[PDB]
Design an enzyme around this catalytic site. Structure first.
Site, PDB file in Angstrom:
ATOM      1  N   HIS D  39      13.109  11.169  20.211  1.00 38.26           N
ATOM      2  CA  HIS D  39      13.237   9.721  20.312  1.00 38.26           C
ATOM      3  C   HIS D  39      11.935   9.010  19.967  1.00 38.26           C
ATOM      4  CE1 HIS D  39      11.105  10.405  24.022  1.00 38.26           C
ATOM      5  NE2 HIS D  39      11.094   9.114  24.299  1.00 38.26           N
ATOM      6  N   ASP D  61      16.648  16.006  22.504  1.00 38.04           N
ATOM      7  CA  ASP D  61      15.792  14.890  22.106  1.00 38.04           C
ATOM      8  C   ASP D  61      14.358  15.355  21.849  1.00 38.04           C
ATOM      9  OD1 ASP D  61      14.740  12.374  21.551  1.00 38.04           O
ATOM     10  OD2 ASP D  61      15.902  11.384  23.129  1.00 38.04           O
ATOM     11  N   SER D 113       5.201  10.448  27.133  1.00 35.33           N
ATOM     12  CA  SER D 113       6.147  11.529  26.927  1.00 35.33           C
ATOM     13  C   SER D 113       5.517  12.647  26.107  1.00 35.33           C
ATOM     14  CB  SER D 113       7.400  11.011  26.224  1.00 35.33           C
ATOM     15  OG  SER D 113       7.070  10.414  24.983  1.00 35.33           O
TER      16      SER D 113
END
EC number: 3.4.21.90
Lengths: 52, 162, 162, 162, 162
Positions: D39, D61, D113
């Site tokens: 993402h 993802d 992330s």
């Protein structure tokens, strides 16, 4: 028609080779602070002085 | 003493080439002509020079451009003559012989292309497009200028692009 | 020291040109020839010199006139040769190289045309017709005299008349 | 003392992801595999890694890419076992229990992330794709590695992408 | 003393506009309304502000956006009334008279659009879209708000976009 095609191909190849000639003449002499030489422009006129 | 040589070497400045915050190379001006390697792509640090129209060299792998008149004074002076010996380069002194320039192995890599070579008096002798390590030294694919006013690119065999 | 250079520079005198109380330029005499830029108009300070008949140069933008024999001794001595270095000029020393004369930017403006350039020994090397600032230095549209006895006007591009 | 734990934590380095001068995340390499959340888009800071061909994982993802053999030595060590206790993470220590990792509220946001979690010995246990604050702590949607050699992503409900 | 005025000036903060690592301008929020010049393009530093939907003003050359209610408290206070005198601005004090704001020549350039002008009490009087130097002072193409609650943009002739 074939003769016309042959003539056109010959002219196009001549144009390609003359562009190669202009590049080969100027590029060694372009890459310099002077980059202008009367003798070469007289003998081949690789670069157009009027055109810019 | 090498300290004074380094001090003299670190005097002048060049204009780097940026690509997305990454310096792929350098774009120097010598004698009123803007130069940068063609294989190296990016944006020149200075906006004005970046706005200049440039032309490509198919066999010479660099671009050329005329600097504006109002800025041609601020340019580096060239030297067609190359006496034997060592020359100052940004990373360090360059020891050259037999017409080819050598640097200590492990000096110079990608992004160091286009950095000019200065003499003792600061005049630029040649600029480097790349180099290949061949042992204790590392030959450089430099492009020099001849005495008659011509351009010469001494590239070693299977050299490495920078 | 530059003080001695300035003192040697400020020894000789020249003859300016006046127009309605305004100094549009100077008219110097070298070798028995009166010189003044053609674009510069006015009356020379010396009545006799101004009374001398003159002829014009279309492509050189200056006039020429021969002083009388009794006055040809009192003139400046010329020199065809211009070895590399710096030369003394009225406003300041002139740093020249590659056949073109440069002065620090911000030096020289309108009304400074026709002022000669002196060498170390005072011999006149060339006179300046105008100048354009092109960076850290300022190239000047000077007219020089050749070794063979000819006259050469090294004019930088888009120069400014002074 | 927590000072020593922080100092041990801050030793190793990772590779960030840049997008127009913006750090959307980080791309870590462990066990010879390059990992980055799918993402999160951008360009890896390292040119070589960014040039690697990657494939996408639809339900996980994230992307994967194999490092070259000559550089597989310089990579982080994995560990399938996750004993109960607290673990070191870049922002701070992670308190984990019942198989889910918790961090203090107000710690960790967008752009964090992909940053790995290190054990006491420096071996990476799992990496974070995102997190949701649920009160005094904030659970993180990390993907862990199983003992048998499998991949598990414990994603808390209505997690927030980072 | 002007030092105290500068100190009072440098208390509050604004939110700049970034475009590829370049600060093209600033986007201020006053009274719960987000503003940024329409001619200036880029992304706001604050992500939340950057994500806000905006509409354009054809002639006013700026965009407007309503901040969320929880953040409308944290906004700059405006003042419709503009008594004669000098006002504090980020680069320096602004001397304004005859309904137009003036700054010393050489102050303010590109990228300075959107920077607000504060009164003595910190209430913002107007923001500047650009400016043109006309001599010793420099008029700025500022947009003010009228006492009735209207918006008026006093633009000097042939202003320069900033």
């Amino acid at each position: 028609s074939i003769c016309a095609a042959i003539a056109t191909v010959s002219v196009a190849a001549s144009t390609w080779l003359f562009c190669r000639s202009r590049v080969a003449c100027l590029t060694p002499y372009r890459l310099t602070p002077n980059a202008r030489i009367p003798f070469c422009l007289a003998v081949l006129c690789c670069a157009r002085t009027a055109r810019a | 003493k090498r300290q004074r040589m380094v001090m003299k070497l670190e005097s002048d400045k060049t204009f780097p080439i940026m690509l997305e915050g990454k310096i792929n190379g350098y774009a120097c001006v010598v004698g009123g002509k803007l130069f940068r390697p063609m294989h190296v792509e990016g944006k020149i640090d200075n906006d004005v020079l970046a706005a200049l129209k440039t032309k490509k060299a198919s066999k010479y792998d660099l671009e050329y451009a005329d600097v504006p008149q109002n800025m041609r004074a601020d340019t580096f002076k060239y030297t067609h003559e190359k006496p034997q010996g060592y020359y100052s380069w940004h990373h360090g002194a360059v020891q050259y012989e037999n017409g080819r320039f050598t640097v200590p192995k492990g000096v110079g890599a990608k992004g160091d292309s286009g950095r000019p070579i200065l003499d003792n008096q600061g005049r630029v002798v040649a600029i480097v497009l790349g180099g290949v390590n061949e042992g204790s030294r590392t030959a450089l694919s430099v492009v020099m200028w001849n005495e008659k006013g011509v351009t010469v690119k001494y590239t070693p065999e299977n050299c490495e692009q920078w």
